[PDB]
Design a protein around this ligand. Structure first.
Ligand SMILES: CCCCCCCCCCCCCCCCCC(=O)OC[C@H](COP(=O)([O-])OC[C@H](O)COP(=O)([O-])OC[C@H](COC(=O)CCCCCCCCCCCCCCCCC)OC(=O)CCCCCCCCCCCCCCCCC)OC(=O)CCCCCCCCCCCCCCCCC
Lengths: 63, 171
């Protein structure tokens, strides 16, 4: 191979791996903040559906 | 938290209906026919305000209308009514089916002297409509501000950047 080819292919390898490494660091930081605050699409542990609530006029009025 | 705000004892004084349950059961159908409107205003106020402290004037109108109902019974048809609720009062379960001739006497005298018609089967169980002048309760549960939901997802789903990014797997 040419030193041009090896050199620039090395640069492409370094680009792709540095991009993946910074994305892994952002992956860890996003996971930390979403477990801590709980305001993202992840770690949304289920609560009770409010579509299950009956809203009809019941037998007694104090409810 | 906050101090609970109760009405005074003078806000609760009203002339009571001091009659027995068999007396109330004997003229129950004429009470439902004749005392319809303030009773339904009260029960609409009671199922909408969801607070008996917001219903005291409507309950007092209920009590006034019931007292006028039994005074209008007592002036004209006191003795067939007494004959009828005594026979209702004899039974333990207080059956209407056991006392049809005293019922016929009471309903006859009531239709002849007071013009009241006893309702048919099905009528008192109707869901009626009530014309009120009080405003609709804007928050009867006193529900505070709801929490804002989590943001939804949006945008076209692009591929993963350089695959899985799992240590060396390039896809
Ligand atoms: C227009 C339509 C038509 C188009 C046609 C185009 C194709 C034309 C050719 C047709 C054939 C296509 C074949 C697949 C494409 C080439 C894949 C390839 O070489 O990837 C290089 C791949 C990564 O190297 P690369 O230089 O970065 O990528 C070059 C390309 O970009 C590679 O491309 P990439 O970057 O996209 O690769 C993605 C990713 C790249 O890889 C990675 O990201 C790295 C992780 C890979 C897995 C590592 C696991 C390590 C731990 C487990 C080790 C297990 C034991 C090892 C083997 C023991 C003996 C069986 O791949 C994987 O992770 C796949 C998993 C590994 C399977 C590789 C494909 C095998 C196909 C044939 C199977 C036959 C058996 C093979 C032996 C079984 C084990 C492989 O090399 C390895 O992982 C080394 C292991 C050996 C790979 C198999 C070589 C394929 C041909 C084998 C022929 C001889 C078989 C002999 C008999 C059976 C064995 C006794």
């Amino acid at each position: 191979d040419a030193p041009e080819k090896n050199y620039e292919r090395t640069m492409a390898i370094l680009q792709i791996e540095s991009e993946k490494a910074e994305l892994r660091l952002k992956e860890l930081e996003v996971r930390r903040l979403m477990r801590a605050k709980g305001d993202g699409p992840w770690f949304q542990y289920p609560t009770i559906d409010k579509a299950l609530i009956d809203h009809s006029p019941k037998a007694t009025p104090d409810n | 938290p906050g101090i609970v705000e109760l009405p005074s004892l003078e806000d609760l004084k009203v002339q009571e209906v001091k009659v027995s349950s068999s007396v109330l059961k004997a003229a129950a159908h004429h009470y439902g026919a004749q005392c319809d409107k303030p009773n339904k205003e009260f029960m609409l106020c009671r199922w909408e305000e969801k607070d008996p402290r917001r219903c005291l004037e409507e309950g007092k109108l209920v009590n006034q209308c019931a007292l006028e109902f039994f005074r209008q019974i007592k002036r004209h048809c006191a003795e067939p009514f007494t004959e009828y609720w005594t026979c209702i009062d004899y039974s333990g379960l207080q059956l209407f089916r056991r006392c049809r001739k005293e019922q016929a006497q009471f309903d006859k005298c009531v239709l002849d002297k007071l013009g009241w018609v006893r309702p048919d089967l099905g009528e008192l169980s109707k869901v009626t409509k009530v014309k009120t002048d009080r405003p609709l309760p804007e928050n009867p549960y006193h529900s505070r501000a709801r929490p804002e939901p989590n943001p939804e997802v949006e945008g076209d789903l692009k591929p993963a950047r350089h695959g899985s990014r799992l240590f060396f797997w390039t896809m």
